[PDB]
Scaffold this active site. Structure first.
Site, PDB file in Angstrom:
ATOM      1  N   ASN A   1      -4.470   4.341   8.955  1.00  0.00           N
ATOM      2  CA  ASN A   1      -3.437   4.320   9.993  1.00  0.00           C
ATOM      3  C   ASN A   1      -3.806   3.437  11.191  1.00  0.00           C
ATOM      4  O   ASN A   1      -3.167   3.522  12.245  1.00  0.00           O
ATOM      5  CB  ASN A   1      -3.067   5.743  10.419  1.00  0.00           C
TER       6      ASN A   1
ATOM      7  N   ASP B   1       1.859   5.400  11.844  1.00  0.00           N
ATOM      8  CA  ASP B   1       2.217   6.712  11.266  1.00  0.00           C
ATOM      9  C   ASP B   1       2.346   7.808  12.304  1.00  0.00           C
ATOM     10  O   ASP B   1       1.427   8.602  12.518  1.00  0.00           O
ATOM     11  CB  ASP B   1       1.263   7.105  10.124  1.00  0.00           C
TER      12      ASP B   1
ATOM     13  N   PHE C   1       3.242   9.736   2.979  1.00  0.00           N
ATOM     14  CA  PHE C   1       4.680   9.872   3.212  1.00  0.00           C
ATOM     15  C   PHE C   1       5.553   8.698   2.702  1.00  0.00           C
ATOM     16  O   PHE C   1       6.749   8.667   2.995  1.00  0.00           O
ATOM     17  CB  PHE C   1       4.937  10.159   4.703  1.00  0.00           C
TER      18      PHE C   1
ATOM     19  N   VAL D   1       5.704   4.597   0.173  1.00  0.00           N
ATOM     20  CA  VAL D   1       5.163   3.335  -0.296  1.00  0.00           C
ATOM     21  C   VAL D   1       5.616   2.284   0.711  1.00  0.00           C
ATOM     22  O   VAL D   1       6.776   2.279   1.125  1.00  0.00           O
ATOM     23  CB  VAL D   1       5.595   2.992  -1.753  1.00  0.00           C
ATOM     24  N   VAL D   2       4.702   1.397   1.095  1.00  0.00           N
ATOM     25  CA  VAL D   2       5.006   0.303   2.021  1.00  0.00           C
ATOM     26  C   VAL D   2       5.118  -1.006   1.247  1.00  0.00           C
ATOM     27  O   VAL D   2       4.186  -1.407   0.533  1.00  0.00           O
ATOM     28  CB  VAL D   2       4.041   0.249   3.241  1.00  0.00           C
TER      29      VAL D   2
ATOM     30  N   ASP E   1      -2.849  12.370  12.976  1.00  0.00           N
ATOM     31  CA  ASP E   1      -3.188  11.765  11.690  1.00  0.00           C
ATOM     32  C   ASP E   1      -4.000  10.473  11.896  1.00  0.00           C
ATOM     33  O   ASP E   1      -3.735   9.455  11.266  1.00  0.00           O
ATOM     34  CB  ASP E   1      -1.914  11.541  10.843  1.00  0.00           C
TER      35      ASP E   1
ATOM     36  N   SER F   1      -8.632   5.551   9.252  1.00  0.00           N
ATOM     37  CA  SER F   1      -8.662   4.071   9.132  1.00  0.00           C
ATOM     38  C   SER F   1      -7.445   3.452   8.407  1.00  0.00           C
ATOM     39  O   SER F   1      -7.090   2.297   8.676  1.00  0.00           O
ATOM     40  CB  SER F   1      -9.967   3.606   8.487  1.00  0.00           C
TER      41      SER F   1
ATOM     42  N   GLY G   1       0.809  -1.195   0.000  1.00  0.00           N
ATOM     43  CA  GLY G   1       0.000   0.000   0.000  1.00  0.00           C
ATOM     44  C   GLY G   1       0.842   1.245   0.000  1.00  0.00           C
ATOM     45  O   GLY G   1       2.067   1.182  -0.157  1.00  0.00           O
ATOM     46  N   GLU G   2       0.182   2.383   0.180  1.00  0.00           N
ATOM     47  CA  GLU G   2       0.843   3.672   0.207  1.00  0.00           C
ATOM     48  C   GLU G   2       0.085   4.668   1.030  1.00  0.00           C
ATOM     49  O   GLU G   2      -1.129   4.535   1.242  1.00  0.00           O
ATOM     50  CB  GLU G   2       1.139   4.195  -1.224  1.00  0.00           C
TER      51      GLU G   2
HETATM   52  C1  LSV Z   1      -2.778  -7.851   3.358  1.00  0.00           C
HETATM   53  C2  LSV Z   1      -1.547  -7.012   3.076  1.00  0.00           C
HETATM   54  C3  LSV Z   1      -0.817  -7.531   1.833  1.00  0.00           C
HETATM   55  O1  LSV Z   1      -1.526  -7.326   0.651  1.00  0.00           O
HETATM   56  C4  LSV Z   1      -0.655  -7.047   4.325  1.00  0.00           C
HETATM   57  C5  LSV Z   1      -0.407  -5.609   4.623  1.00  0.00           C
HETATM   58  C6  LSV Z   1       0.412  -4.974   5.513  1.00  0.00           C
HETATM   59  C7  LSV Z   1       0.476  -3.601   5.571  1.00  0.00           C
HETATM   60  N1  LSV Z   1       1.256  -2.874   6.472  1.00  0.00           N
HETATM   61  C8  LSV Z   1       2.180  -3.310   7.331  1.00  0.00           C
HETATM   62  O2  LSV Z   1       2.444  -4.428   7.452  1.00  0.00           O
HETATM   63  C9  LSV Z   1       2.778  -2.340   8.235  1.00  0.00           C
HETATM   64  C10 LSV Z   1       3.435  -2.612   9.438  1.00  0.00           C
HETATM   65  N2  LSV Z   1       3.777  -1.525   9.979  1.00  0.00           N
HETATM   66  N3  LSV Z   1       3.385  -0.477   9.237  1.00  0.00           N
HETATM   67  C11 LSV Z   1       3.526   0.852   9.397  1.00  0.00           C
HETATM   68  C12 LSV Z   1       3.024   1.692   8.475  1.00  0.00           C
HETATM   69  C13 LSV Z   1       2.365   1.151   7.371  1.00  0.00           C
HETATM   70  N4  LSV Z   1       2.259  -0.129   7.242  1.00  0.00           N
HETATM   71  C14 LSV Z   1       2.750  -0.960   8.144  1.00  0.00           C
HETATM   72  C15 LSV Z   1      -0.349  -2.875   4.699  1.00  0.00           C
HETATM   73  N5  LSV Z   1      -0.318  -1.493   4.752  1.00  0.00           N
HETATM   74  C16 LSV Z   1       0.323  -0.815   3.655  1.00  0.00           C
HETATM   75  C17 LSV Z   1       0.398   0.679   3.936  1.00  0.00           C
HETATM   76  O3  LSV Z   1      -0.825   1.249   4.301  1.00  0.00           O
HETATM   77  C18 LSV Z   1      -1.406   0.610   5.379  1.00  0.00           C
HETATM   78  C19 LSV Z   1      -1.559  -0.865   5.090  1.00  0.00           C
HETATM   79  C20 LSV Z   1      -1.160  -3.527   3.817  1.00  0.00           C
HETATM   80  C21 LSV Z   1      -1.197  -4.890   3.757  1.00  0.00           C
HETATM   81  O4  LSV Z   1      -1.900  -5.660   2.949  1.00  0.00           O
END
Ligand code: LSV
Length: 291
Positions: free
Chosen positions: A153, A166, A36, A38-39, A148, A151, A32-33
């Protein structure tokens, strides 16, 4: 693990398949993104991690972004709690933050059933709402203003436990700023005016509760009303009921607890910041809802 790790940019580049921007299902690494960065999904010590590659995707400078990187490390080192995301490490040799992987993504993704996931039950939604309030409580008890809350976050671990994320815009603590930042659709009227107060986090949490109840995004450009917080007035002016807006993708909602959650959301959304409940009262009300 009991320590923070300093990763080289090349290791993070490697474990994310060179920051592969394609989605997970096609063999990519993009999860996702946000505003600030791309994750990406990463694999380090036979351990899946989340890697945020920082980038000013919204309207901020390189110095403001580096400042948010520093602030996030500082706040995340200081604030370690069961309802907050866990920082694992970082890279600054191209700024990257490395977190404990949240397999169920964000509350926003789950409410939209992104990628074919089943809708969250009302039971699951109540537990998430309680967990999110507990995370906000820890931050407010520890004199931090999130700034911030939304949903996107609120992340969900292997047990669907709510983990607030975040912390780049977070502030140690009413002060006013010349730099208005945040997501418009969730912001309190005083925050849009430049005020920095924990009372604004409450308001933003009220919008999140409406998203949980309705399954609707806080904003939709092709929807009428475009803003979700407007439904509070539609309901107050008796032109609509909460039953008209309750997510139809649930089968286990009951009027009693839905009306109890809506009452919490309404109180959070008071236009006057001093009339809003504080986080301790929000926790009490959400606990009473399922008692
Ligand atoms: C089912 C899956 C795979 O398709 C597993 C998964 C994990 C994370 N995120 C993380 O694992 C994560 C851990 N700490 N963190 C901190 C900030 C943002 N993201 C994270 C996110 N995020 C991406 C950024 O936006 C929020 C959602 C989506 C996602 O979809």
């Amino acid at each position: 693990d009991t320590r923070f790790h300093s990763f080289s940019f090349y290791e993070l580049k490697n474990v994310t398949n060179n920051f592969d921007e394609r989605p997970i299902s096609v063999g990519g690494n993009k999860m996702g993104e946000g505003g600030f960065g791309v994750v990406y999904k990463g694999y380090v010590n036979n351990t899946t991690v989340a890697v945020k590659k920082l980038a000013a995707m919204v309207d901020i400078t390189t110095e403001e972004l580096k400042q948010q990187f520093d602030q996030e490390i500082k706040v995340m080192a200081k604030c370690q709690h069961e309802n907050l995301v866990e920082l694992l490490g970082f890279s600054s040799d191209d700024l990257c933050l490395v977190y404990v992987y949240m397999p169920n993504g964000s509350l926003l993704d789950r409410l939209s059933c992104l990628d074919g996931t089943p809708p969250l039950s009302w039971h699951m939604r109540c537990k998430i709402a309680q967990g999110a309030a507990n995370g906000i409580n820890f931050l407010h008890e520890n004199h931090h203003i999130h700034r911030d809350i939304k949903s996107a976050n609120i992340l969900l671990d292997e047990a669907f436990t709510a983990k607030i994320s975040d912390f780049g815009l977070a502030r140690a603590s009413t002060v006013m700023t010349s730099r208005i930042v945040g997501t418009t659709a969730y912001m309190a009227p005083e925050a849009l005016r430049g005020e920095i107060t924990p009372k604004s986090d409450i308001y933003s949490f009220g919008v999140v509760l409406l998203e949980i109840i309705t399954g609707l995004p806080a904003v939709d450009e092709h929807r009428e009303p475009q803003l979700l917080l407007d439904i509070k007035e539609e309901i107050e002016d008796e032109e609509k009921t909460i039953e008209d807006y309750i997510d139809k993708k649930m089968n286990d909602a009951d009027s009693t607890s839905v009306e109890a959650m809506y009452s919490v959301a309404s109180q959070c959304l008071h236009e006057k910041k001093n009339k809003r409940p504080d986080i301790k009262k929000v926790q009490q009300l959400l606990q009473e809802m399922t008692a």
